[PDB]
Amino acid sequence: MVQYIFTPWRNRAELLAVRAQFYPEHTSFQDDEHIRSEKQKAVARVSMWMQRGGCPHMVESTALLVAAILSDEAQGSGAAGGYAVRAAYSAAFSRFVTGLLDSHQDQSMYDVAKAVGLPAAFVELRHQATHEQLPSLTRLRSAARRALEWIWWYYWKGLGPVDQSGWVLYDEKEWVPKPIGIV
């Protein structure tokens, strides 16, 4: 029975829920704040999974992108004073692109990209980011947004439809066997 794939999400409903928070638009002033809050919680949750171990690459990438976007749209004396936002964005793009290219490989960067179907802009943007000069905020912003929609088509949309009394030995007269995790 090699048909056993381990995940870090207790069951399925939880994964779907996370999806809902990450993309309110497709799934469905005060209302805007509410949405912002949910996004933050989703990000944190993904962090936990990553530590737990064994998490799909794409999920990690999406978490990173949204995290950056949230930081960019923060009005107050906490807005990452213009030179940090561009860094968060560059980090996310590097991780994301590197993952796809590295995984699907037996060629040159551009050919692998074309094969997978990933627009060339991203590969170029990553290269620029690492080697010579962080890119302009505007470009990064638009790039991130597109990337998110792309990931949607490639991964998310397929995960389903769219609708000393300290220690006491438990009494061996009331215990029942039950799956590790439940109580």
Partner: protein, 528 residues
Amino acid sequence: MHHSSFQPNNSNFQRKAGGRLVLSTPDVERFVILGNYGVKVHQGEVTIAGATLTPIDDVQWVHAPHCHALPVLRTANDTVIELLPCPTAQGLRELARLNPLFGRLWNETSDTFQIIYTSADAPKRTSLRELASHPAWNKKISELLTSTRRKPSPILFICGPKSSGKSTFGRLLTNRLMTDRAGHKSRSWKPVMVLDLDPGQPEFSPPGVVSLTKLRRPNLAPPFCHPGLSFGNEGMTTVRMHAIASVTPALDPAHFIACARDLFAYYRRSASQENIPLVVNTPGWIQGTGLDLLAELIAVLRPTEVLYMSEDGPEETVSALREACASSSTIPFTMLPSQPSWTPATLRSMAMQSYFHLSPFGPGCEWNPTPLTHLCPWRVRLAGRPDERGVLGIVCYDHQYAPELVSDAINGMVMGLVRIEKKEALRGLAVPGDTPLLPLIPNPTGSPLSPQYTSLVGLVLIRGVSLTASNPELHLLTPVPPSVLHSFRGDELVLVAGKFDAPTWAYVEGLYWKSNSKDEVPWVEMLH
């Protein structure tokens, strides 16, 4: 009664008597036995993977798992050997019902041990390897031994790149030193201490833990057959262990070295009285960070002899080693050959699983075949004070967590039960008190609790957090015997949650049992 083949060698009178075999050999002959058996030289002399047994020798149990290299047995002129069947081995066999990876590890025959011939026995799924040893290795060992006899008690530092074979060399050296007996009333066997600083594929402890072990009998078994020596005549006891909570010392080098220091300290104190040599094997790095660690360790331990098992290793490592080695006034540095399937990942995992099923108490140690899910758990209270609670709290390593998430994060992983000796440990941390929430101990810095005041009392697996609004509690199952757990109040007892590599095997175990003997198992997604 006149057996013959190619691979092992000849033989002779094979009298089958009530389960045991009395075999006499009138000339040098080498056998390869695959199974769980026991040796007891009756008249003459035998050599077993590094030890020497003569008439004045108690029974020696030897587990020969088909995974590694089957211990070779050599008999010297005119000898009578009696092979006994191992009993406690029966328990371990059934572990196959809870993980296929434990099924193809022994003899697929009827009995418990079988002599191998050319290829007739030792069935398919081949690579019936054989424990060898270059003449060089043997020559070097010979030199070390003789030097030791005309000197004090030396500390030997073995190291080298992974897969180079450091393991085998260590086994040989240890057995030889202990069992030699060569020139004075057999001097029966001088105790031998082993220091393992390799969290990768440890020896005498489960993954993730560093430790100092004291042996009395020839270590004849792989690492997944005694990973949990008793804690406390007394064949193989354990003096001290430390939780590093990773599978690579590359997450807090400072802590790692501090650990090495404390362990050495104890060895110093004990050794001072009765001449007991020390054999230490280091991790498996040879570049960057690791190379620096090695240099440091060499400085702190001040090894008498450094043995590098590569003979073709990169120039950088050799150069660095020679420098650092030369610095501590003068240290003999040498190189040797190496002889470079089961990838370290699976092996490690098997170690861990074996440890958990270790029963709560020549023979070795017993194993319990019941699945973890069935075992009843330890109910620890989570609402009280530092004197009527149980677990003082939960500390995190290398990473923090927001409060909400912790309940989900901890659940299902493996943690260490660290016992605080002196209150000079939790000095700088807000220890929650009177108080429902998991009493988490905020630890900004991140550095693990210092190694000078805290010791590890065996790992713990968590199978259920239930904070249902008035009786906060944790359901956890451990291998530690009741006695010790009960002999700890509650204040001095903290749980450490690091990496440890999520015990994925545990979940599936329940299912395999149910189907072999013949639905929302969290974390497990069944494809259909």
